Every structure is written in structure tokens, then in C-alpha cells.
Design an enzyme around this catalytic site. Structure first.
Site, mmCIF file in Angstrom:
data_model
loop_
_atom_site.group_PDB
_atom_site.id
_atom_site.type_symbol
_atom_site.label_atom_id
_atom_site.label_comp_id
_atom_site.label_asym_id
_atom_site.label_seq_id
_atom_site.Cartn_x
_atom_site.Cartn_y
_atom_site.Cartn_z
ATOM 1 N N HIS A 77 36.896 31.181 39.849
ATOM 2 C CA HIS A 77 38.147 30.760 39.233
ATOM 3 C C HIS A 77 38.081 29.315 38.759
ATOM 4 O O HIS A 77 38.774 28.448 39.276
ATOM 5 C CB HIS A 77 39.296 30.971 40.207
ATOM 6 C CG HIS A 77 39.618 32.415 40.435
ATOM 7 N ND1 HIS A 77 39.309 33.070 41.606
ATOM 8 C CD2 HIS A 77 40.198 33.336 39.628
ATOM 9 C CE1 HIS A 77 39.698 34.333 41.515
ATOM 10 N NE2 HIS A 77 40.241 34.520 40.326
ATOM 11 N N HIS A 81 35.948 30.699 33.604
ATOM 12 C CA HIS A 81 36.786 31.902 33.667
ATOM 13 C C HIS A 81 38.014 31.744 32.753
ATOM 14 O O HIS A 81 38.421 32.689 32.077
ATOM 15 C CB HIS A 81 37.239 32.211 35.100
ATOM 16 C CG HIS A 81 38.313 33.259 35.178
ATOM 17 N ND1 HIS A 81 38.092 34.577 34.832
ATOM 18 C CD2 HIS A 81 39.618 33.180 35.539
ATOM 19 C CE1 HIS A 81 39.210 35.267 34.994
ATOM 20 N NE2 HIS A 81 40.152 34.442 35.423
ATOM 21 N N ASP A 235 41.951 39.244 31.868
ATOM 22 C CA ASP A 235 41.646 38.750 33.212
ATOM 23 C C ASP A 235 40.684 39.691 33.939
ATOM 24 O O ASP A 235 39.822 39.253 34.704
ATOM 25 C CB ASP A 235 42.947 38.601 34.002
ATOM 26 C CG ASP A 235 42.823 37.678 35.178
ATOM 27 O OD1 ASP A 235 41.953 36.780 35.163
ATOM 28 O OD2 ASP A 235 43.614 37.844 36.123
ATOM 29 N N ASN A 238 35.766 41.539 32.939
ATOM 30 C CA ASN A 238 34.347 41.302 33.271
ATOM 31 C C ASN A 238 33.487 42.558 33.169
ATOM 32 O O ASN A 238 32.437 42.538 32.529
ATOM 33 C CB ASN A 238 34.171 40.717 34.680
ATOM 34 C CG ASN A 238 34.696 39.288 34.815
ATOM 35 O OD1 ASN A 238 34.897 38.806 35.931
ATOM 36 N ND2 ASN A 238 34.932 38.614 33.689
ATOM 37 N N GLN A 286 31.582 46.925 43.268
ATOM 38 C CA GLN A 286 31.830 46.899 41.827
ATOM 39 C C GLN A 286 32.156 48.294 41.306
ATOM 40 O O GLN A 286 33.040 48.461 40.469
ATOM 41 C CB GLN A 286 30.633 46.329 41.073
ATOM 42 C CG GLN A 286 30.533 44.821 41.129
ATOM 43 C CD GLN A 286 31.817 44.138 40.688
ATOM 44 O OE1 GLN A 286 32.408 44.479 39.657
ATOM 45 N NE2 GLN A 286 32.257 43.164 41.475
ATOM 46 N N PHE A 289 35.658 49.056 42.278
ATOM 47 C CA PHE A 289 36.527 48.170 41.504
ATOM 48 C C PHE A 289 36.797 48.791 40.123
ATOM 49 O O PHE A 289 37.934 48.865 39.652
ATOM 50 C CB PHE A 289 35.852 46.791 41.403
ATOM 51 C CG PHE A 289 36.606 45.775 40.594
ATOM 52 C CD1 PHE A 289 37.959 45.564 40.792
ATOM 53 C CD2 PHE A 289 35.936 44.996 39.663
ATOM 54 C CE1 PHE A 289 38.640 44.611 40.052
ATOM 55 C CE2 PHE A 289 36.608 44.044 38.920
ATOM 56 C CZ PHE A 289 37.965 43.850 39.117
HETATM 57 C C1 LIG Z 1 33.205 40.927 38.690
HETATM 58 O O1 LIG Z 1 34.060 41.306 39.605
HETATM 59 C C2 LIG Z 1 35.367 40.869 39.768
HETATM 60 C C3 LIG Z 1 36.042 40.178 38.831
HETATM 61 C C4 LIG Z 1 37.352 39.782 39.051
HETATM 62 C C5 LIG Z 1 37.972 40.063 40.186
HETATM 63 C C6 LIG Z 1 39.416 39.653 40.477
HETATM 64 N N1 LIG Z 1 40.035 40.345 41.298
HETATM 65 O O2 LIG Z 1 41.351 40.153 41.701
HETATM 66 C C7 LIG Z 1 41.568 40.315 43.168
HETATM 67 C C8 LIG Z 1 41.404 39.141 44.132
HETATM 68 O O3 LIG Z 1 41.198 38.108 43.486
HETATM 69 N N2 LIG Z 1 41.488 39.296 45.492
HETATM 70 C C9 LIG Z 1 41.730 40.630 46.069
HETATM 71 C C10 LIG Z 1 41.670 40.631 47.607
HETATM 72 C C11 LIG Z 1 41.394 42.013 48.184
HETATM 73 O O4 LIG Z 1 40.608 39.768 48.046
HETATM 74 C C12 LIG Z 1 41.023 38.410 47.853
HETATM 75 C C13 LIG Z 1 39.927 37.517 48.420
HETATM 76 C C14 LIG Z 1 41.315 38.123 46.365
HETATM 77 C C15 LIG Z 1 37.317 40.757 41.118
HETATM 78 C C16 LIG Z 1 36.011 41.169 40.964
HETATM 79 O O5 LIG Z 1 35.280 41.912 41.936
HETATM 80 C C17 LIG Z 1 36.023 42.545 42.932
HETATM 81 C C18 LIG Z 1 35.465 43.950 43.403
HETATM 82 C C19 LIG Z 1 34.649 43.670 44.332
HETATM 83 C C20 LIG Z 1 34.541 42.176 44.506
HETATM 84 C C21 LIG Z 1 35.935 41.875 43.971
HETATM 85 MG MG LIG Z 2 44.796 34.389 38.784
HETATM 86 ZN ZN LIG Z 3 42.168 34.903 36.231
#
Ligand SMILES: COc1ccc(/C=N/OCC(=O)N2C[C@@H](C)O[C@@H](C)C2)cc1OC1CCCC1
Ligand SMILES: [Mg+2]
Ligand SMILES: [Zn+2]
Ligand SMILES: COc1ccc(/C=N/OCC(=O)N2C[C@@H](C)O[C@@H](C)C2)cc1OC1CCCC1
Ligand SMILES: [Mg+2]
Ligand SMILES: [Mg+2]
Ligand SMILES: [Zn+2]
Lengths: 328, 324
Positions: A77, A81, A235, A238, A286, A289
């Protein structure tokens, strides 16, 4: 070019209108100023400076300040990004199914929201901030804690010296853009995903298109909804990118997640899902996800703008196969 | 002394709260909260050190603004006491847990803390730091909550120190839900949903309401504190008159700042062109009566005396307005 470089950045910026811009390359070539460079490029391309009488030096000054307030030591972040989501929104805005649907003010709101939408992100989740009784969660009553913060910061930075890029909007214009930007960034809270998608499917079911297949949106509710989902898709874009891009985003999000898990472990807290470096299945994660979040979202966007997003969907499917193939 | 005799009415609608403020040295919130906590056995139930309680309450009371004519410690004390009365309505007997009772009363106590005496819309329209912080959304109510909880951090002020982690978590969610519901911009949506809840309400044999999930329960607590917040016109005339004086003083001061700033002056905020009778009758007709007749429906016939007073006060104020 809006920042000191040297150079060949121009050849890479030729892809600013394409999915699969190599934004990491841009970061390197621009002295880690991808957000400033890409925003400046987009504002010029879309003639936004002329339309809204934004002084170029004011735009650059605000972008430099905004970029500085993304943390350099946060793996995912960060300013890259932010630049990515900005550029991704910029591409989605130009999809043929949306031709001439949005006003220049709406376009400006989407792009501005994309740019600020994670500013001052600390590299830990809302739930972490809540669980640790952070001052931020106290401030925002445990509700869209980060997203409320990102907006507060993004707008407050307009007040820095020579930073008010909206100084020549009318009162009504600034008010409308402010409402839209707020609606959009608050919609990036993942806790709102299921509802947002649910409503997006509904809109899709009853969508209206001209003869050439251009979407007909009737009111603010329709327009803001499409913009909210658009930036949400950006957002979460990816895994729809060229694999080499996707692979680096995966590396970065896991690095960031693992650092939160380390903070949790150190305080004897339960380690959050997918934040335990000692017990992780990055590849399997992934795939899940994509299956449960990204494909259902993008399948629906693809429906909305059919057939504009087909190749994005095909790439998503190919990339799903890749991580599948590499589960140990 | 005299104070003790006035506090005997703490379980009754129409408590002389202004008298209590005068008699306690301007500590109505502290005196009334202490009394209610003692009456409901809250100190014992949640192991709250009485010294901690008073320290918190005194600090909380300190953070209501002296120079603000309506949204001050007396309003806070009034809403606390009114909520305390509504909690004991027969139709709600034994319905709420002690934690939920604590949440409703604590929410009432903090629900306007550090109120600046101007509206959300004013704060939004003047580009205030509060509005920038809260993205124009329930600006004051988010702020009240933040301050109310932040004060728990002061020395010997954590009255929830002996709650379990889970109790504290539940209390915190409930209080947030309740204070956010005091935002008047949410009034019509609250009322629309309350009407639908009333339509399908379920009661035991003895006639008490059955609220079998958090959603239905918090909804009732939300509307209860909202009624308490909007309870001035349901009070005896001598009290209601005093509240009307104060809200108009407060509004007119906002109007004054709007006029100086060259802004268009908000409704009911122009001291030169404002009518008290006309404004209260509209307030009753379009906000307070629709809400209270819905509450009265929910708990019928528990609130008929309250509804009767409101309707009398409405008739009273409309009587000096010339009409065809
Ligand atoms: C390239 O992959 C990603 C790109 C973006 C994101 C953004 N995700 O939003 C959720 C978040 O931010 N959390 C969710 C919570 C459960 O956990 C909290 C620490 C925060 C996640 C990605 O991968 C996932 C899938 C497996 C690893 C994460
Ligand atoms: Mg955000
Ligand atoms: Zn974002
Ligand atoms: C004793 O009377 C009152 C007690 C309490 C309240 C509380 N009202 O809540 C809303 C509010 O504060 N505002 C601010 C301003 C923009 O106007 C509103 C449309 C929204 C109002 C009372 O009387 C009315 C009638 C004339 C004065 C107000
Ligand atoms: Mg090329
Ligand atoms: Mg209030
Ligand atoms: Zn109030």
C-alpha cells in the site's frame, strides 16, 4: 514529464492508455515518482488542467506532497499501488461502453479518488487497527477506519502551500466532486465488497444500452455506482494484469501481510488470515482470492461493459492457472 | 438536602433537571448518572469503582461546553434521565441485559459531548476541521463518540476496566450504533423502519416485547435514545419552555455567524425573522409527534401519558397563532 528523470520514461508512458503498463518500470525510471508522473500524464492527456484551470505547478506540488504521504517502507500500500489504481481507473474510464457517459468533473473525481484512496496507509488492516485500540479506530469509531483516514488526508493536503488543485472549481463543483470522491473512496473498504457487488449485479440485470452498446445511466445514483465499482475493480485489478506484474503484486502483498502477522505474533494476538509467514500457502491463497473475490467482481464488470473487458477476463483465467500450477 | 428531595423523582418523566443543575453546582450530569448507576446497581454488576465513576463523569461533564445554550451538560443529563425512564417501560420488562442498559445510558451521557453549538450542515458549509476529519458524514455524532471514549483514557477514568474483553467489545459496538442514530439526517430512515418493526412486533404472554436478535434489540435502543433526545416537547410546559428558549438562543447565535460570514442564514436561525410558536408547532407536527406516536404504538399503552402531554403542548402553542 512532471519530475526530474533521464529518461526513456517516454517510451514506457506510451502505454499509459493500456492495461499492462509496466508501472514498476515507471517507478524506477522516475525516481520513485510513479504517482506524480502518471497523474501529470493523465491530466495532460485528458486536458484536465485547461478544463478546470489547474495551474501545472500547483498540480505537481500537490502530487509531490500526496506521493510523499504514501509510506516508502510499506510493501504494497504505497505510491506505486496508488499510481497503479490511478492508471487502471484511467483505462477503465475510456472503455467503449462508457463513451461520453461521464462529465469531466466525474472523470476528475474518479481519478482524484484513485490517487488518494490509500494515502498514509500504515500497512496494517482495519481489523488490526481496531483490535489494537489504535487512535485511528478511536477517531473513526471502528468504521471504515483507513478509508475515512485516506480521504481526510487527501483533502487536507489541498491546503498546503500552492496545493489546491481545485481552487478554480465553482463552489457547487467542489461540493459535487467532494461528495463523489468521498462516496468512491469509502467504497474501497473491503468490508463493503459483497454488498457492492450484489448491487452491481442488480444494475447489470437491468442495464440499458444504445444501439452501439453504450451504457445509458440516468441519474447520480447510476453514475456514482458505476464509478464506485470501477475504482473498486481497479483496486482489485492485480490478478487481471500481465502475469509478471501480478507476480510482483503478490510478492508485495504477502510481504506486507507477513509484517502485520509478525506484529500480531509479537503481541501474542491471534495471527490474521494469510498473515502467518510460518504457515502460508501463497499460491493456494491467490487461487482462492480469484475464485471468491476477483473473478466474481470482474465477471460482473465484464457483463456491464460487454464485450469491452473480455481480454481482462481471459488474462485473469490464465493467471489463475499459473498460481494453480505452482501450488507445491 | 433539597437536592435529595428532587432526585427522588429520578424514575419519573418531568424531573426538575434545571433545579438539579442549580443545586449540584452545575453538575446535573454527574449527579443524575451517579444516582441512576446506584439505582440500577450498575457499580456492583460491572465492578465499577465509585471513585472512577465520579472522576470520569466529572471530566465528561467538563467537556460539555459552558457557553452553549442547549447542547450542554443539562441536555446530556436530561437525555440520560429520560432514557433511564424509557428503559423501565412495562413493555420492555426484563428484555435488555444489564450490559445493554449500561450501553443505552452511557450513550445518552456522551451523545453530545464537546458540541460546538452549531449544526453538522454549518460545519460542512464552513469547511470546518471537524467536517474535513469526518468526510461530512455524521460529523458531530462521530466526534461525540470519539471524545466520549477518549476520556476513558484519562487517569482513573476507565469505568469499563472490569468488563470482560467481549463485554467491552459489545458495549462499544452498541454505543456507537446508538449515538450515530442521534444524527437527525437519519431520522426519517429510523422512523420508517421503526414503523415496520411495530407492524410485525411480537409480545410474550405478560405482554412484553420479544426482541430475539441484535438487530431488533439495537433498533429499539436506537429509537429509544432518539426519543429521549427529542423529548423536550413531551415534558411539562415549564420545562419545555426553558428548552425552547435555549435551542433558539443557540440557533440564533449560529445564524449570527452565518450572517457575518455573508452566508445564507439557516432555517430558524434568523433572530430577526423567526417565530417560536410557528417553529415549535412545525417541529412537533413534522418530527416529534410522528416519532413519539410510533414509540407509543410500540409500547402501548405505556407511553400514553407522554403522548398526551405532547399533544396538549402542541394544542397550547398553536393557540396563539391566528388560523382560519
Ligand atoms: C495480489 O494479491 C492481492 C492484492 C490485493 C489485495 C487486497 N486485499 O484486500 C484485503 C485486505 O487488505 N485484508 C483482508 C484481511 C483478511 O487481511 C488483512 C491483513 C487485510 C489482496 C491480495 O492478496 C490476497 C489473497 C491472498 C493474499 C491476500
Ligand atoms: Mg484501501
Ligand atoms: Zn488500494
Ligand atoms: C425545544 O426545541 C427543540 C429541541 C431540540 C431540537 C433539536 N433539533 O435537532 C436538529 C437541529 O438541531 N438542526 C439544526 C438546524 C439546521 O435546523 C434543523 C433543521 C436541524 C429542536 C428544537 O426546536 C426546533 C424548532 C425551533 C428550534 C428547533
Ligand atoms: Mg511499447
Ligand atoms: Mg446530537
Ligand atoms: Zn442531543
Amino acid at each position: 514529464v512532471k519530475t526530474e528523470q533521464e529518461d526513456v520514461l517516454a517510451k514506457e508512458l506510451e502505454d499509459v492508455n493500456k492495461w499492462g503498463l509496466h508501472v514498476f518500470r515507471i517507478a524506477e525510471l522516475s525516481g520513485n515518482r510513479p504517482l506524480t508522473v502518471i497523474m501529470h500524464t493523465i491530466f495532460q492527456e485528458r486536458d484536465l488542467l485547461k478544463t478546470f484551470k489547474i495551474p501545472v505547478d500547483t498540480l505537481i506540488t500537490y502530487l509531490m506532497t500526496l506521493e510523499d504521504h504514501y509510506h516508502a517502507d510499506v510493501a504494497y500500500h504505497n505510491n506505486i499501488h496508488a499510481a497503479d489504481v490511478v492508471q487502471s481507473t484511467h483505462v477503465l474510464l475510456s472503455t467503449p461502453a462508457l463513451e461520453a457517459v461521464f462529465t469531466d468533473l466525474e472523470i476528475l473525481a474518479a481519478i482524484f479518488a484513485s490517487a488518494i484512496h490509500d494515502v498514509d496507509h500504515p500497512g496494517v488492516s482495519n481489523q488490526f487497527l481496531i483490535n489494537t485500540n489504535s487512535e485511528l479506530a478511536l477517531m473513526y469509531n471502528d468504521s471504515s477506519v483507513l478509508e475515512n483516514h485516506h480521504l481526510a488526508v487527501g483533502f487536507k493536503l489541498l491546503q498546503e502551500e500552492n496545493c489546491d488543485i481545485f481552487q478554480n472549481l465553482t463552489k457547487k463543483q467542489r461540493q459535487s466532486l467532494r461528495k463523489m470522491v468521498i462516496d468512491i473512496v469509502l467504497a474501497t473498504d473491503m468490508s463493503k465488497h459483497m454488498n457492492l457487488l450484489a448491487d452491481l449485479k442488480t444494475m447489470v440485470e437491468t442495464k440499458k444500452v444504445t444501439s452501439s452498446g453504450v451504457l445509458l445511466l440516468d441519474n447520480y445514483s447510476d453514475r456514482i455506482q458505476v464509478l464506485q465499482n470501477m475504482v473498486h475493480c481497479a483496486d482489485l485489478s492485480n490478478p487481471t494484469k500481465p502475469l509478471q506484474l501480478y507476480r510482483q503484486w503478490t510478492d508485495r502483498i504477502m510481504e506486507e501481510f507477513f509484517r502485520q502477522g509478525d506484529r500480531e505474533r509479537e503481541r501474542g494476538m491471534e495471527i490474521s488470515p494469510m498473515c502467518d509467514k510460518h504457515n502460508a500457502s501463497v499460491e493456494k491463497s491467490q487461487v482462492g482470492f480469484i475464485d471468491y473475490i476477483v473473478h466474481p467482481l470482474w465477471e460482473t464488470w465484464a457483463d456491464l461493459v460487454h464485450p469491452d473487458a473480455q481480454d481482462i477476463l481471459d488474462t485473469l483465467e490464465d493467471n489463475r492457472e499459473w498460481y494453480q500450477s505452482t501450488i507445491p
